[PDB]
Symmetry: C3
Subunit: 600 residues, 3 copies
Amino acid sequence: ANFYVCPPPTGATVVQFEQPRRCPTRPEGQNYTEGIAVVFKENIAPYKFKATMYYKDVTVSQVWFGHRYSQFMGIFEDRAPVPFEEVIDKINAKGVCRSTAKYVRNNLETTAFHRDDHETDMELKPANAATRTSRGWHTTDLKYNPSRVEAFHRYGTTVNCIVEEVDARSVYPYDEFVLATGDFVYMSPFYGYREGSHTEHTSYAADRFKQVDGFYARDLTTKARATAPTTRNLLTTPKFTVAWDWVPKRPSVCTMTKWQEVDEMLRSEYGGSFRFSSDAISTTFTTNLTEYPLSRVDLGDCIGKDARDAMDRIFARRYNATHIKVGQPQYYLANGGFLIAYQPLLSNTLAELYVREHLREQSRASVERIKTTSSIEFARLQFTYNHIQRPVNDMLGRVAIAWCELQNHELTLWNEARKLNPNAIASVTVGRRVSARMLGDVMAVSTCVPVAADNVIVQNSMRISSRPGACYSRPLVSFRYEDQGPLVEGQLGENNELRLTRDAIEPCTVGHRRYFTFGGGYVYFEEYAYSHQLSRADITTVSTFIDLNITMLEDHEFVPLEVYTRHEIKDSGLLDYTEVQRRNQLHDLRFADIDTVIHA
Amino acid sequence: ANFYVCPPPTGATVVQFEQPRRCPTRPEGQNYTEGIAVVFKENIAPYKFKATMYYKDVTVSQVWFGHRYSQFMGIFEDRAPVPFEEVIDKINAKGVCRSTAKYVRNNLETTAFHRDDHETDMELKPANAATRTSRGWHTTDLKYNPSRVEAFHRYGTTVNCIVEEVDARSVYPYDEFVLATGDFVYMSPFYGYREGSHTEHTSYAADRFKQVDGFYARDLTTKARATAPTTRNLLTTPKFTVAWDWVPKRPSVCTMTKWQEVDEMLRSEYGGSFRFSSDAISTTFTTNLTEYPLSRVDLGDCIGKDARDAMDRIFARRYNATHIKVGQPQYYLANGGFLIAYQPLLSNTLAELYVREHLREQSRASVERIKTTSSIEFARLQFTYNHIQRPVNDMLGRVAIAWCELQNHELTLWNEARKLNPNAIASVTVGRRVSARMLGDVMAVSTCVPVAADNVIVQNSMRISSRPGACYSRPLVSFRYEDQGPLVEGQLGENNELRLTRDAIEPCTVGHRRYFTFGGGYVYFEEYAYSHQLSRADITTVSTFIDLNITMLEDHEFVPLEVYTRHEIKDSGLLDYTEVQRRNQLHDLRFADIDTVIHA
Amino acid sequence: ANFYVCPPPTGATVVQFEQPRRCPTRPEGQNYTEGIAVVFKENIAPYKFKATMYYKDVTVSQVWFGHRYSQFMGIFEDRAPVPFEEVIDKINAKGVCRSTAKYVRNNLETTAFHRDDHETDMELKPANAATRTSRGWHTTDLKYNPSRVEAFHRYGTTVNCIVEEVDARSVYPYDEFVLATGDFVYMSPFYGYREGSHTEHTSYAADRFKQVDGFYARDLTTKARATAPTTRNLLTTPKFTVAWDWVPKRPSVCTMTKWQEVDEMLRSEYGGSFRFSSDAISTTFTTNLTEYPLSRVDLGDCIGKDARDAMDRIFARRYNATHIKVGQPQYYLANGGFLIAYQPLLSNTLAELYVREHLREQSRASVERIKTTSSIEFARLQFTYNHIQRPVNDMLGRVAIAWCELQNHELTLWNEARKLNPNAIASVTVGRRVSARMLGDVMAVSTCVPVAADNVIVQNSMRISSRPGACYSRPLVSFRYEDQGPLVEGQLGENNELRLTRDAIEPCTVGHRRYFTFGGGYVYFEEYAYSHQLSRADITTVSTFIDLNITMLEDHEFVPLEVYTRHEIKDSGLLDYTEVQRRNQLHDLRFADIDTVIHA
Ligand SMILES: *[C@@H]1O[C@H](CO)[C@@H](O[C@@H]2O[C@H](CO)[C@@H](O)[C@H](O)[C@H]2NC(C)=O)[C@H](O)[C@H]1NC(C)=O
Ligand SMILES: *[C@@H]1O[C@H](CO)[C@@H](O[C@@H]2O[C@H](CO)[C@@H](O)[C@H](O)[C@H]2NC(C)=O)[C@H](O)[C@H]1NC(C)=O
Ligand SMILES: *[C@@H]1O[C@H](CO)[C@@H](O[C@@H]2O[C@H](CO)[C@@H](O)[C@H](O)[C@H]2NC(C)=O)[C@H](O)[C@H]1NC(C)=O
Ligand SMILES: *[C@@H]1O[C@H](CO)[C@@H](O)[C@H](O)[C@H]1NC(C)=O
Ligand SMILES: *[C@@H]1O[C@H](CO)[C@@H](O)[C@H](O)[C@H]1NC(C)=O
Ligand SMILES: *[C@@H]1O[C@H](CO)[C@@H](O)[C@H](O)[C@H]1NC(C)=O
Ligand SMILES: *[C@@H]1O[C@H](CO)[C@@H](O)[C@H](O)[C@H]1NC(C)=O
Ligand SMILES: *[C@@H]1O[C@H](CO)[C@@H](O)[C@H](O)[C@H]1NC(C)=O
Ligand SMILES: *[C@@H]1O[C@H](CO)[C@@H](O)[C@H](O)[C@H]1NC(C)=O
Ligand SMILES: *[C@@H]1O[C@H](CO)[C@@H](O)[C@H](O)[C@H]1NC(C)=O
Ligand SMILES: *[C@@H]1O[C@H](CO)[C@@H](O)[C@H](O)[C@H]1NC(C)=O
Ligand SMILES: *[C@@H]1O[C@H](CO)[C@@H](O)[C@H](O)[C@H]1NC(C)=O
C-alpha cells in the first residue's frame, strides 16, 4: 500500500452529488378478458355411413372326366347385381331370392340358372360366423358340378344370392364412396330427387338408380319389419346392388371437427393481434383481431351448433352464478389453421360496465377449407415462453424500481457522512484519493500525491516532551517525497494519510492502547511508545457486507427424441400394398420363362 | 424549487422507525432420490416370424388353331395345396415334388397331370434371381400347350410345384397372420397341441392342420439336413400349404416395447405424485405414487426380463463401486401411457441408512393394454419449465433474503444519521418537509409551510456591523409568507430552509469562500460578501449511486414448423391402394359401354 | 426484551471490518457471426415423371344359347402389349391402331382378331370423361359376342387398343418404377444406351427395350406433332408397352430436399461445436466444427445448386448494400440429420478485417444417405432454453456485480458510523450485544451480560438534588444482576443499556419532554419527572426500509396434447388394404363349404 500527501483544498475545484433520479414506473398490467372457447381443426375423418350390398355369386365350371380322374378345365366366376324389383319384392318383403341371375354383361343379356334347373324362390340364411365381420346372409354353400359322364367336357352353373351389410366411407367433395369390400361407387352418398339432391354427382344412367320413399327395412335374421320409415336409395352397379338410407348433405358432413373445449381462455390484445392463451392445456394462439366470417367455411354448419352447445354447457357448469355473457359467440382464425369460437364473459362484481363492453365486443361470394397443421408445439412453446418471460420481467422491473429507490434513499446518509470525514467520502465518490473541505453546501477537492512505503518512518514516541501531560493523537512521522529527497516533518493520518502538521494534541492518559494503519498493516503503541508492527491478518475481521450467492443457469443440451419413428409407424401396418404388389408381380419373372416360344 | 419555513417542533407529534423485520427462511431443498430407470411404450410392431409356403401352380389353357394362326380361347389358373404326406416324404425328405396336383376345389376332388403325362417325381431347382426377394424354388418354367391340330380347341395342363420362404406377420390378439404374398391365414401362429396351445384360435377343420415333433428341415439349395430338431406346424389352406416352427405364446410376444434406458432418473415426491426427471434425455414424467401391478399388463412377461437386464447392466457399468441397490425394481404408470421401471439407489457415503430406506421403499382378475401417446413434447416441456423455474426461484429467494437483511443492517446507520440532521432524515422518512427535534429515544415532527421563490431576497453581506470580527455562518434573508405580505427577518438554512433566527455566528476568517443552495441553484460569496448567482449545472457532479441496467426479456413469436407434413408422409409411399383402386375400377366406365345391349 | 450491562472495553480483544472485495468481472459477450443459411432434409418424396402406356384389351367369351336364354359359359380377359413397330408407325405417326393383337403368352405366339374379321386400321378416340383422371384414348367400346345359334357354344373375340397417360413413381436406388395403374416396371427410369446409362438396372431381355433418338410425340386429341425432339424410351412388358422420355440420373434425382431458407442464421462457437440459431424460425442446431464433405452425399448434385441460388437471392434482397461475403458457402451436418449450407457475412462498417476472416473461415471413396429425424422440437426447445437462459444469466450477473459494488460503497459509511456509536455498530457487526471503544484505527469489544426485565426499576425524577439547575440526561435506575441479588446503582442508556455511572449531566431546561426505551416499550417523562409507561405501538411508526415484493414462479403441469392421434391419421385413408384383404379372403369361409366333397 502507498501513502498519500494532500495539500489544503481551495476553491479552485468544487464538486456536488447527483440529485435523486426518477425511478421507473410500474408497467401497466395486461388486459385479460375471461371467456369460454372451443377450438376446431381440419376434418380428416371420412364420412362414414351404413349400407347394404346385394349380389349373386354366379359361377359356371367346365369339368373333364377321365378314365380314373376328374379335372377342372375352367372355372368362370362373376358377380351379378340384384334388380330393384327383386330387392324390394323378394328379399326385403319375404327374405327369399330368385335362383336365376339375369343381368347385362359385355353388352349381352346373359341369364343363369342354379343347377341348370327351373327357377325357384330360395330362402336366405346367415353365413358362417367370422370374427370381426359384419352380418351377412347367403342361400347356397355347396357348389354344383356336372354329373360324371366318361370322356366329356360337361358344364354346371351355381347361383348363390348373397346380401351383406358393409360400412361405406366417403371423403370431400363427397362425389363418390367406397364399401368395406373395396368396391367403388361413383355416386354421391347424398344423391337423390328431393330438395335439390339431384344436383349431386352421378356417373350412372338414370335407370340404374331408384329411390323408395317410406321404406320399411326388414331384418333377415330376426323377421321384424322395422319401427319407423326411411328414404332408401338403390343403385344397380355393373357387378352389385348397393342400398343405403338417404340424408341431407349439409347437416350430415362438416369440414371442421371439434378438437378442444377450454373452460378458461384468456384473451389479450397487443401488437395488433389477439392472444388466446389457455392455462388448462398450456397453449397460446394468435389471430388478426377480425372475426373470421363463418359463412366462408365450406360445409361448416356443424361449427355453430357444436360451439353453442359446448359454450352453454360450460357456462351452466361453471360460470352460471359468477359471470355473465357479453355478446354472441365470436369466431377467429388462429395461426396454424385453428378456428377458435370465443365467448367473452364479465364478472358479476362489475356488471355495471356491461353496456360499455357489449357494443365494443360487437365491433370485432366464395368458400374455402381451412388447413390445420399437424403440430401444436409451436403454440405450446409460445405459452411456455410467455409463462416464464412475463413473470420474470415483472420481478426484474420490481428489482430495478426498488434498487433505484434505495439509491435515492441513501443520498441522505451521504449528505451527512461527508461532513464527518470529507476526505474519505470525497475519495470514494470522486474515484481517487483527494482531500476535501466543506465550502458551505458544496465540497472542494485537491488531488493527493502518492508516497513510497519505504520513504516513511514513524517516530517511536508520541509523547510531547515539550509539555508533560500533553500527547499527540497520532504518531509522528518523517517522509521524503522522493527516493533520496530531503525528509519532510509530518504526522500520520487516517488511511495511510500523511498530514504536514503536528496539531493533533490530546492530554496524556494512563493505559494508552492504540492501533494505527501503516502501509499494509498496523503499528501498535503502548503508553505513548512504539511497540511493534503487525500484519493485517493478525486482527480478527468481521464482515459488514451482506453476502449474495447468485448462481448462473447451467447450459443444457436437448438430444433428439421420438416415441415412434416414421419407419416404425409404417411397419405397424399388418400388410403393405407396395411390398405385396412388388413380390406378386415378380412371380412370372421368377417362376417362369417370359421369352421362350414353342411352336410346331 | 420552493423554500420552506418550519417552526420549533414540540411534543404534539412523535414518530419512530420500524424495527428490523424477520427475513424469509431459505426454502427446503427438494428430496431427489437417485436410481436407474427403463421406460416402456405401447408395442405397435406386428409379431414377425419365418414361414415356408408350398403350393402347385396348376394351369390349363384352351388353344384354337386357325389356318395360319393360334389363339388362346381361355386360360384357367389356380393354386393347389401340397398335402402333408408329400411335403414330408418328397420335398423335405428328397427335394422332389410330384408332377400331379390332387386337391379339393368347388367341392370336387379334382386332379391334374403335368403335360397330361403319367406321374413322375420332378426335381426342385432355385428360381430366377430377383433383387430384394426371399429364396424360392420351383420345378417347371416352360408352360405346356397342346400340339397343333388344324381347326380344334385342344387343352393342355401344366403343374409347377413351387415352394417359397416368406415373412409372416401377426398383430394382437394374434388370432391370425398374413404372409409376404398377402395371403391371410386364419389361425393363431401359436396354435398347437402341447401345453394348452389347442385353446388358440383356428378357423379350419381339424384334419387341415398337422404338427410334427422332432422335425429336421432340409434346405433345398444346399442339401444339408439341419443341426437340431424343431416343432413344425403344417396347415393346408384351400389354395396353399404353409409351414412354420411352433413356439410358446407368452415368451414370444409382448404388448410393451423397451423405449429408453436412463442411467440417472431422479425421483421427487410433491403434490401427491412422483416426478421422474431425466437430465440425459431432458424428460419429466408423473405418476400416482402407487406401483402399477405388473400382473395387470396383458402379455407383459418381457417387461420384467428386459427391465432387470438393463438395470443390472447399467448398475455394473456405473453404480458398481459408488451406490447400492435399495429394494427390488418398482414399476409405475406415467401420464401419457409410459410404464417406468424404477430401481432406487443409495450412495455408499450414507449406506448406514439402508435399513431405514428399504422398508419405506417397499411400501410403494383382469388385464389391460397400455395406450401410449405419440408425442413426448408434453414431458419435454415439463422438464424445460422445471429446469428454468426451479433455479430462477432459488435466485429470487436469495435476492429477497439478502435484500431484507440489508434493510435491517442499514437500520443502524439511520439511528445515528437522525441525530446529526433530524430535519433531513425526518423529511425523507416521513415523506414531507418537516422539522424535527430529538426528544430522547423518539423524534418529534412539525410540518413546514412552503414559500414562493420570488418572495425571498438575500442580504449582500453577513458581516456583523455591531461586532467586527464576528460573521454569520449562513447568509441573511428577508421573506414574506404571502405574495405582498409583510417581509419577515430570517436566515438561510440547509436545503432551501429558512430559519427565523440569526444565531449562527462564527469568527470572520480571511479567504472566505462558500456556496449555499438557493432555489434551483446556488449563491456564491467571497470575503463575506455576495458575488453572484449560478445554476446547478455550473458545478461538477459526481454520481454517488450504483448504476444497475436491468433489461426486460424481449417478446418472441413462434411460427409453425414441421419437418414433414402429413401430406408429405402420405406421398412417401410408392403406391397408394386408394388411388390405384379408384383408377382401375373406372376402366369399364372409361373404355367401355356399360348400358348398351346387343341381341338378335 | 432483556436489559444489558457492559463493562469498559479494554485491549484484550480487537476487531476490524473486512476490506472491499473484488467484484466479479462482466462476462465476455458471445461471438456471433452473421450469415445466410439453407437447411436440407432427407428426401422421402419418390421421383415422379410422366409416362405413356400402350396395350390392347383382348377378350374372348364363350356363349351358350338356350331355347329361350343366353348364358356366358366363360370369359377370358388378357392385356396384350403393342409392339414398337406399331407404336412408332401407326399410333404416333397416324393415330391408328391395328385391330389384331399379336403377342407371346405362356410361351406361345398367340394372335387375336377383332370380331374375328380381317385386320383393319382403327381410329383412336378419347375415352369417356371421368373426374380426377388422366387423358386416355381407346378404339372400341362395344364388346363383340357370337351370333345366336340354337344349342351351341360359340366364341367371339374383341380387341380394344387402349393408350393412356399415367404418372410414374420411383424410389431410391431408382432401379424400378410403378405406374398409376399399380403395374411394376423392373427397369431403372434412367436406363438407356447413352453416357453410361446402360449400367442401370434392367430385368428384361435386350430385345424388349428400344430407344428412339429425336422422337417427335404426336398428341392424339389435338393432331399437333410437338415442337422439339426428345429421347423416347420404349419397353415391352409381358402385358403392356410403356414409353417415357429419357433423362440423365444425376441432375434428375436428389437424396436431400431443401427445407428452409434462413435470412439470419447466427453462428457461435463454444464447447467444441458450432451453434446455428435462427431467430426467425426459433430453431438451434449443433455441428462438429468440421465441414461435412459434400462429395460424400449420394446423388447430392442438387444441394450445391439450390444452396447457391438461395444464398444469392437472399444476399441481393437484404445484404446487398450492408454486408460482404466471406469465403465460399460452407456445409455442416447438424444433429438429427439436417445438412446446413452456411454463408458467412461481414458488415461493411468493419470490412478492413476481411483479409483476417477469409483465411480463418476457409480453414473450416464412399457415399452415404443422411437420415433426418421426423421431429424438430429437440432444436426448438434448445432455442427456447437459450433464449431465456442467456438473458436471465446476464441480468443475474449485473445484479451480483451491482450488489458487490454497493457493499464496498457502504464500507465508507460504516467507517464513520462506528465512531458516533461504537456500541451499536459493534453489536450488529459482531452479532451480539458488546460494548466498544475506539483504540485508534481498530475497535475493542467486551461482551455484555443480560439482565432480567423484572430486576430493574427506574427512579421517579432525574432532578439532581445536590446541584439545583443540574439535571441528568437519562433516567436513573437500580438493577440487581441476580433475581434476589443486591441492587446495583446505575443509569439508563440507549437500547435498554444499563451503564454503571451517573455522569450524563445537563442543565435543567423548562418544557422538558422526553421518551426513553425501557424493555418492550418506553418511559415518558415531563419536567424531569416520571409520568407513565407506554407500549411500543403507542407511537406512530414510519418504515425506513425499501419494500421489495419478489414472487416465485408458480408450478405448471403440461398435459398431453395432439392435433391428430396416430389412429386418426390411419383412419384418414379412404380404403385400407389390410382390412379389405381380410374381409375379401373370408368370402370362401363365410359363404361356402370348404371341406365337403361331392362325387358319383
Ligand atoms: C392476417 O392478415 C394478414 C394481412 O394483414 C394476412 O397476410 C396476408 O396473407 C395473404 C394471403 O393471400 C398474402 O397474399 C399477403 O401477402 C399477406 N400479407 C402480409 C402483410 O403478410 C394473414 O394471412 C392473416 N392471418 C390470418 C391467420 O388470417
Ligand atoms: C391416478 O389416479 C386417479 C384417481 O386418483 C385416476 O383418475 C381416475 O381415473 C378413472 C379412470 O377410470 C376415472 O374414472 C376417475 O374419474 C378418475 N378420477 C379422478 C379423481 O380424476 C388417474 O387415472 C390415475 N392416473 C394414472 C396415470 O394412473
Ligand atoms: C461428431 O463427432 C463425433 C466424434 O468426435 C461423432 O461420434 C462418433 O460417431 C461414430 C459413428 O460411427 C461412433 O462410432 C463413435 O463412437 C462416436 N464417437 C464419440 C466420441 O461419441 C459424432 O457422430 C459426430 N456428430 C455428427 C453430427 O456428425
Ligand atoms: C386496458 O388497460 C388500460 C391500461 O393500460 C386500462 O385503463 C383499461 O381499463 C383496460 N381495459 C380493459 C377493457 O381491460
Ligand atoms: C343457474 O343460475 C340460475 C339463476 O340465474 C339458477 O336458477 C339455476 O338454478 C342455476 N343453475 C345451476 C346449475 O347452478
Ligand atoms: C457461495 O456458494 C458457493 C457454492 O455453494 C460456496 O462455496 C460459498 O461458500 C458461498 N459463499 C457464501 C455462502 O458466502
Ligand atoms: C426430505 O426433506 C426433508 C426436509 O423437507 C428432510 O428432513 C428429509 O430428510 C428428506 N428425506 C429424504 C428421504 O430425502
Ligand atoms: C464391481 O464391484 C465388485 C465388488 O462389489 C468387484 O469385485 C467387481 O470387480 C466390480 N466390477 C467392476 C466392473 O467394476
Ligand atoms: C444502460 O443501458 C443502456 C442500453 O445499453 C445504455 O444506453 C445506458 O447508457 C446504460 N446506462 C449506464 C451504463 O449507466
Ligand atoms: C471472440 O471473442 C473474444 C473475447 O472473448 C474477442 O476478443 C474476439 O475478437 C472475438 N472474435 C470474433 C471473431 O468475434
Ligand atoms: C446491389 O449493390 C450494387 C453495388 O454493389 C448495385 O449496383 C445494385 O443496384 C444493388 N442492387 C440492389 C437490388 O439493391
Ligand atoms: C406484497 O405483495 C402481497 C401480495 O400482492 C401484498 O399482500 C402485500 O401487501 C405486498 N407488500 C407490500 C406492497 O409492501
